[PDB]
Design a protein around this nucleic acid. Structure first.
Ligand SMILES: CN[C@@H]1[C@H](O)[C@H](NC)[C@H]2O[C@@]3(O)C(=O)C[C@@H](C)O[C@H]3O[C@@H]2[C@H]1O
Ligand SMILES: [K+]
Ligand SMILES: [K+]
Ligand SMILES: [K+]
Ligand SMILES: [K+]
Ligand SMILES: [K+]
Ligand SMILES: [K+]
Ligand SMILES: [K+]
Ligand SMILES: [Mg+2]
Ligand SMILES: [Mg+2]
Ligand SMILES: [Mg+2]
Ligand SMILES: [Mg+2]
Ligand SMILES: [Mg+2]
Ligand SMILES: [Mg+2]
Ligand SMILES: [Mg+2]
Ligand SMILES: [Mg+2]
Ligand SMILES: [Mg+2]
Ligand SMILES: [Mg+2]
Lengths: 200, 163, 131, 87, 80, 134
RNA sequence: GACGGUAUCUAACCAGAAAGCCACGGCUAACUACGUGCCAGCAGCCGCGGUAAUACGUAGGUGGCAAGCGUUGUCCGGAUUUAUUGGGCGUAAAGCGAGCGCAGGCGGUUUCUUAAGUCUGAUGUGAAAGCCCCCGGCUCAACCGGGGAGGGUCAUUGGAAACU
RNA sequence: CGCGGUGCAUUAGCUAGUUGGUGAGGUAACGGCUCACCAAGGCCACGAUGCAUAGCCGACCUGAGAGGGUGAUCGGCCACAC
């Protein structure tokens, strides 16, 4: 299953801007629903931990089952802070790599590109948005697809690339030079709360 | 003694208990508030305040907690060693945890640890759930915690020799 | 009747330490002397001396207290008991307060601390914990 | 008699084989005496891993390779070694 | 040559001719609590000439079945 | 207890019992005995249908049926939802579940299964009460 | 070559055929309207319902999850609620009314010795598959393959002698 | 053959080829396996016997672990074929 409902409603429920523009939050920064505009009681600790868990999974557009399995893998990693490793794996997810490279404006758009197969890894077609992208693997657009307005517009519009990504405009090929650092990731999200949530 | 001043203390309301005193006319309702105030750097205290109204009870408890601040040893993000703190019914066991594991603890212990500034720890409550007693038991365990430097100094050997 | 002189020795130290008594005395035995000297060289007790008598001898322990009369010995615990002996293999040797305490262990090489036991990679009978 | 034969493994439509010494009466995927190699027909040049010394020893003891295993051992040259050993 | 199990034990019955009953008297750790508990296994050993008496420490080596219950052969009598 | 005491008489734990015993026992017609089979539900025939008074705190006319299950055990089961079509000799399916109000009801009659008709006009929580999506 | 014109690949067309379930008084993330009036009904526990119900029914919203969702059944956990790890017995359940005592459990100091327990090494074995660790193959994963590790109060055999 | 893995003592006695011996026979083979004699022995509160339940295991589910539960599919062993 893939979520398709309104994007602004989800972002404002989480209280942070998923797209990062802040456009959703700017106007009417209330939780969705008729009781959102009026003052609401404080949230319990469980609610706070749940909200952080939802923040990450809604950011990357994943379902709970896949999210849970990914967290377990992050735990298996031996070195480094557990929450940091989990966020690193979330980044390496194939959809996010396309999004970071800027071939798509949004993660939904990057996901649809991957699903329709316009992307290729190391010159090979890959239709699995869930695909794990290692450091140094070259993500490129399918040659037939290179001449489509959507991806070209996204490239020209995206002006800021994270340090860890290296991209080439003409070739439309990118790759992660190194694993993203904690501060490079979203700081507003607190990985410790998610860790404790799944500790249950 | 730890002076509250010069420390950027923040508080959390652990529990707000509506207590009753029976009076000839009927019930006299008051609010008892348990508060934990901490510095997120190793200082934390707990205070109790009773008042007819919830905000006033909380304020009284906050002032009491500041008076009772204590400092907790910390090695990295976790406590030095395993410790069991017992007060009355309350009984808590707190163990160091690996970095990033989070705060595994329940209810009032969560507030005490977060406010103290401990980020990773494993805790189990073997006693009652009574919030006041569990908080007291928690601070008893933390006071039991010992610094490697202090132990090395006391025993007359270098910390390297100790470990 | 006394069924564990070792546990009696540990409890004598514990009681004397609780009241901050300056010294204490116990009937002497080889295992007790070993425990006392381990505490001496680990700095838990100030000093140890031996009195020779006609019964079994006596061992006198001078307790150690830090500045502000703080107790050096937090507590002592008897692990191996006559009711239930406790044996640990070389890899099972425990850590008392992550090394801030010690475990006295009797091995084929003698009575040694847990640090020494896992340095030699030998197990033994876990006589006591101290911290 | 003792057989050197292929025990099937892998998944549906994606077979793999372990060259194992087993008694003829035993089930194909059941009891076997020892594993002596592997065989992956799905590779364009069929990939074979073999413990040639162990296979030769079993042949000397009197094991009877099945037809496919005999072809595999021939391609690996074990059969010629066994022939020369008989000489 | 491979070796058969040999056990030490104490005779407890010699009222049968050409045979004795021995007791091994081992100890085993309780699975849950680990205390050592006294455990008694007894064997029926064939005596060649009824030499051994009751309450004798003797050694017995396992053998082929000599009777319904016999499986051991007397070797030595170390104490009377 | 001492370790020797525990050795001489080890710990023994309490044995639990089912809240829905009738579901735990099957019946073998040939041998004419009861078997030990855990079943999520069980088929029964309504020997009686009616209403019952709750316990003291509550007041209502709770709708119930006395049912003889396929294993010949007779129990009393509740009928959830508003309005039903059950009658005696109606074949029903029973699931576990107590009713706090009622004294001796330990099972619920599944709606939408066998002769139990779904609840008319149900529109929320339709899975329960066994109504199709309108 | 049964599978089988099966997997797969290529090309054209169309957002067009393809989202439900449960929950929202506290525990527990999720709230307001009507209708209802200790009735109808809910409910896992606390408990809701007597004319102004966030707890019933409907509606609108919201939360959880998702080709699933929920209910029941059964097992483990939470349960330290049989406590070896890891509880108790003055008043909450719990010291036999008291003693004499067989077996059993435990046992004062010390020299020597032994090596059953205890510790330790080597060897053999604890199949394969499955967990776990590395490395590979299926577009990913599931799955599959390779190589390891583990797993015994194990058997044989060599050491140590503090403790039993 | 050693050792390991269910409940019930509101189940305490059980055993008479039973326990052992000497022969004889029988079996692929040891053996009361069978038989004739000779003895009266053998098992049992370290649970005999009896009753009830059950195919055993590698493994699987849970648990921080100790452990608790399960014994489908897959493989090994065993047993059975109205
Ligand atoms: C006899 N006068 C009584 C007496 O003074 C009571 N106090 C002792 C007083 O107590 C009250 O003040 C109370 O507080 C209780 C109330 C039932 O009656 C009140 O009036 C109470 C007065 O009426
Ligand atoms: K509710
Ligand atoms: K205990
Ligand atoms: K008394
Ligand atoms: K020994
Ligand atoms: K005979
Ligand atoms: K069976
Ligand atoms: K038969
Ligand atoms: Mg799915
Ligand atoms: Mg006070
Ligand atoms: Mg080929
Ligand atoms: Mg409902
Ligand atoms: Mg809530
Ligand atoms: Mg409602
Ligand atoms: Mg338990
Ligand atoms: Mg009383
Ligand atoms: Mg009482
Ligand atoms: Mg547990």
């Amino acid at each position: 299953s893939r979520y398709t409902g309104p994007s602004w409603k989800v972002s404002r429920r989480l209280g942070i801007s998923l797209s990062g523009t802040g456009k959703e939050l700017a106007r009417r920064p209330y939780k969705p629903g008729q009781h959102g505009p009026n003052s609401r009681g404080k949230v319990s600790e469980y609610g706070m931990q749940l909200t952080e868990k939802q923040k990450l999974r809604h950011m990357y557009g994943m379902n709970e089952r896949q999210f849970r399995t990914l967290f377990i893998k992050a735990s298996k990693i031996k070195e480094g802070k557990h929450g940091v490793n989990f966020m690193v794996l979330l980044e390496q997810r194939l959809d996010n790599v396309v999004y970071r490279l800027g071939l798509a404006t949004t993660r939904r758009q990057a996901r649809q590109l991957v699903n329709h197969g316009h992307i290729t890894v190391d010159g090979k077609r890959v239709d699995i948005p869930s695909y794990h992208v290692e450091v140094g693997q070259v993500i490129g657009v399918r040659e037939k697809s290179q001449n489509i307005s959507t991806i070209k517009e996204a490239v020209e519009a995206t002006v800021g690339r994270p340090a860890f990504v290296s991209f080439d405009t003409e070739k439309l090929e990118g790759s992660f030079t190194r694993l993203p650092e904690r501060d490079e990731l979203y700081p507003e999200i607190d990985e410790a709360l998610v860790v404790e949530y799944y500790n249950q | 003694y730890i002076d509250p001043k010069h420390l950027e203390l923040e508080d959390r309301v652990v529990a707000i208990n509506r207590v009753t005193k029976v009076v000839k006319g009927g019930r006299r309702l008051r609010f008892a508030a348990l508060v934990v105030v901490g510095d997120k750097n190793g200082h934390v205290g707990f205070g109790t305040g009773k008042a007819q109204e919830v905000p006033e009870a909380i304020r009284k408890a906050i002032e009491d907690a500041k008076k009772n601040l204590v400092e907790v040893p910390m090695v990295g993000s976790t406590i030095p060693h395993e410790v069991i703190g017992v007060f009355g019914g309350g009984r808590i066991l707190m163990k160091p945890a690996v970095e990033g594991s989070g705060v595994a603890a329940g209810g009032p212990v969560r507030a005490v640890l977060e406010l103290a500034g401990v980020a990773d720890i494993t805790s189990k409550s073997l006693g009652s759930n009574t919030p006041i007693n569990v908080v007291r038991a928690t601070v008893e365990g933390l006071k039991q915690l010992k610094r490697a430097e202090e132990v090395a100094a006391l025993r007359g050997k270098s910390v390297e020799e100790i470990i | 009747v006394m069924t564990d002189p070792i546990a009696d020795f540990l409890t004598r130290i514990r009681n004397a330490n609780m009241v901050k008594h300056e010294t204490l005395e116990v009937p002497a035995s080889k295992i007790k002397r070993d425990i006392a000297e381990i505490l001496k060289r680990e700095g838990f007790i100030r000093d140890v001396e031996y009195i020779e008598d006609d019964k079994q001898g006596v061992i006198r322990v001078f307790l150690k207290y830090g500045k502000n009369e703080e107790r050096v010995i937090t507590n002592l615990k008897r692990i191996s008991k006559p009711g239930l002996r406790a044996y640990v293999k070389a890899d099972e040797v425990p850590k008392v307060l992550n090394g801030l305490g010690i475990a006295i262990i009797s091995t084929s090489e003698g009575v040694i601390t847990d640090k020494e036991a896992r340095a030699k990679n030998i197990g033994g009978e876990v006589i006591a914990y101290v911290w | 008699a003792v057989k050197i034969r292929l025990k099937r493994m892998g998944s549906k439509k994606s077979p793999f084989y372990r060259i194992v010494v087993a008694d003829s009466r035993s089930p194909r995927d059941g009891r076997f005496i020892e594993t002596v190699g592997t065989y992956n027909p799905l590779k364009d040049p069929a990939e074979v891993v073999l413990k040639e010394d162990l296979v030769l020893d079993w042949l000397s003891k009197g094991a009877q390779p099945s037809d496919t295993v005999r072809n595999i051992l021939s391609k690996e040259g074990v059969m010629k070694k066994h022939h020369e050993a008989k000489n | 040559r491979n070796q058969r199990k040999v056990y030490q034990g104490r005779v407890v019955s010699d009222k049968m001719d050409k045979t004795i009953t021995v007791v091994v008297e081992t100890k085993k750790n309780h699975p849950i609590y680990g205390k050592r508990m006294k455990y008694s296994k007894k064997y029926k050993a064939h005596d060649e000439n009824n030499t051994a008496k009751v309450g004798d420490i003797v050694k017995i080596m396992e053998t082929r079945p000599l009777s319904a219950t016999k499986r051991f052969r007397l070797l030595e009598v170390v104490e009377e | 207890p001492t370790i020797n005491q525990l050795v001489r008489k080890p710990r023994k734990s309490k044995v639990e019992k089912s809240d829905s015993p009738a579901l735990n026992k099957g019946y073998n017609s040939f041998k004419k005995t009861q078997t030990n089979v855990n079943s999520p539900q069980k088929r029964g025939v309504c020997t009686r249908v009616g209403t019952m008074t709750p316990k003291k705190p509550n007041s209502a006319l709770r709708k119930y049926a006395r049912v003889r299950l396929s294993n010949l055990i007779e129990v009393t089961a509740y009928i959830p939802g508003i309005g039903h079509n059950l009658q005696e000799h109606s074949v029903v399916l029973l699931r576990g579940g107590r009713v706090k109000d009622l004294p001796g009801v330990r099972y619920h009659i599944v709606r939408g299964a066998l002769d139990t008709a779904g609840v008319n006009d149900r529109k929320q929580s339709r899975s329960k009460y066994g109504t199709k999506r309108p």
